[model samples]
Target chain A: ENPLKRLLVPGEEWEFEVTAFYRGRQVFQQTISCPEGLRLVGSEVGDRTLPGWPVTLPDPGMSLTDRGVMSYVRHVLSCLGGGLALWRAGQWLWAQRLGHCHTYWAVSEELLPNSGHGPDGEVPKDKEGGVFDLGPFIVDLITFTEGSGRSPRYALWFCVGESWPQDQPWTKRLVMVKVVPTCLRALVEMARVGGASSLENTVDLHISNSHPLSLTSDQYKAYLQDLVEGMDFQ
Target chain B: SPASLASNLEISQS
Candidate 1:
């Protein structure tokens, strides 16, 4: 477990911070602490459920108490098992690789192609207007290479690691903001060029996200690093 | 541009 110990040392405790500035004014600052192994699972709730059914179990005085327990049990168990598999895989991967590299998750409204307010449908001078969020997320970094396989676009690429099983119902506006290698390098450069801001006794997660989504208790982030080794972004 | 993408974004905002 010593090698493993070395591997997981970074994530022993996970802390992430994200901030955005508008015209030299601080617009947002948020920090979140994640469980040792946190991954972004898609939203579980949806706009629709099977109708108003019964808010509570049928009164035993009126009918059998069986209710939909068995049916609900089967559905719940299946989903739980699938989600757990994802969670475990995430844990294994995080420990295997990024265990030492602090990671963070961010989503944006600008990076998205449909970010709007541009000519020829291209991002112009940084995305303008509209609010953005990480949206209850834990970001896992996915790296892509330049000019490799299936029409490589950006020199680097990222996706929502352990992203939810379902999209945000297509009714939610959101874009991914993974802490790119470029951004990380930029942070250090800022320190070198602008002078690093010194802090005392800080929990540092090397990865950073610019936006965050609020989360309630019982929700956590998890990650799993890929075993295959290739730089191509897909 | 596809209307779907725009609508998706609009729906998210709404």
Candidate 2:
């Protein structure tokens, strides 16, 4: 296939959908069209990363029940959902600006409000419910460069249902996006120094796909910078 | 009971 057909413009995205299935049943699904030029590629499923729990947990002398086990599982999953979605947004920005990469979107019931644990002495006492301001979550995705429509920079946005009642898994949805650059500098310092390649292969941001594709916060930020820096001299 | 058993067996195999 010919790779050099169109120059990817940042902030351009293609719309896509995410369907949820449980026990071979279509439990939840939604359709979201991102923006023109952006592409949704892969995702991390609807679960959080393992080894997310605190290394220290004071064991209550009493044995915990199945409910407790379920609660902890829920917490880990939510932590993964929230952190990964947030983290992937940053990665998406990097991939768009530098790697010129494909984009992916996924959502997790695990990230339900009150799902993750706070630091010491921050644990919940009454399990008081919290409202999910998806505005801020969506805001987190575009805060650096603003929303997809306003920016010339390549970016992705996940359209989630607005703030809703907390703790319900069925309410969450993440629509992936990709913003292609109008013009890309073929090579740069990072490319020369054994870093990312051009905007074609090296740049697609696959956020919603499964694990092992995830990038650390440092790498994520740096990738965006590489894109900008590469463009700086040009 | 036999009918139930037969259904379960068929479904499992399928």
Candidate 3:
């Protein structure tokens, strides 16, 4: 339980900072302490009871309850046994992958194609020029280890425009920010030292979008590291 | 031109 210990040290509950910035401003900062375990935060409140998990995501986007991402994470960790299996988007798209990585991510908007519920002649669209959220995007850090080796695999849970669409009914979005093998390596090296390599304690998770539908190369912003306590997920 | 590939997000489906 040493704070200064390496994160890749197996069986030791490590504390990590989950900082989120929106529009060049710090909006959220929290800490998660777990050992080969998964945690949840920023959950709202709602009653989710019915046909197992979610199946039909109206917009190819993932949805969550008023309990924020906490409800979904709870269902996965509690229902699926520590996230090895998954039951997402009930009543339409329900599948399970036993014993695989339990980590899940999604955005409120249609960022990726699912093809699961496609071919809808008329999909619901958001209200034109209506405000849904105070913030524009979300970047949650899904803290976990991969391969159980001498390293860790951390992810940046990004909801490009965390704000939901106008007239949308979902409470929160379980957006995903996938860290490719190439980027994951850079994060491990930097996290091990806890940002000591640079002048400031930070790890950048940056993306660029000259346009919402355009695929362009993003720039750099490393991980922002800080040693703090009392995120209080328990 | 002004973006961050540090997160490696370069694709969209909508």
Q: Name the top lDDT candidate.
A: 3
Tens digits of lDDT, candidate 1, B1-14: 23432333211010
Cα deviation at A25, candidate 2, in Å, is 5.8
Give me the runs in candidate 1 sitting further than 4 Å from their true place: A1-11, A18-30, A46-174, A180-234, B3-14
Q: Which ten residues in a row have the lowest lDDT in candidate 3 chain A?
A: A129-138
lDDT of 1 by residue, A1-234 (tens): 111122133334323333322112233334433443222211232222211111111111222453333232222222221111001112222211111111112223223322222212111111121111111111212221111222111111112111221333311212222222222232222223222223221111233332222221111111112212211232
* Candidate 2: tens digits of C-alpha lDDT, residues B1-14: 33422222111010
Candidate 2 residue spans exceeding 4 A from truth: A1-11, A20-163, A167-222, A228-234, B1-14
- What local lDDT score does residue A128 receive in model 3, on the 0 to 100 scale? 15
The C-alpha stretches of model 3 lying farther than 4 A from their native spots are A1-9, A22-24, A36-38, A45-155, A160-234, B1-14
Give interface RMSD, per candidate: 16.0, 19.4, 11.9
TM-score of 3: 0.23
lDDT by residue (A3-98, candidate 2, tens digit) is 111112343332223333221223333433333212122222322232111111122223355344334323322222212111112113221211
Q: Would you estimate the TM-scores of all the predictions? A: 0.23, 0.21, 0.23
Instruction: Please report the TM-score between candidate 2 and the true structure.
Output: 0.21
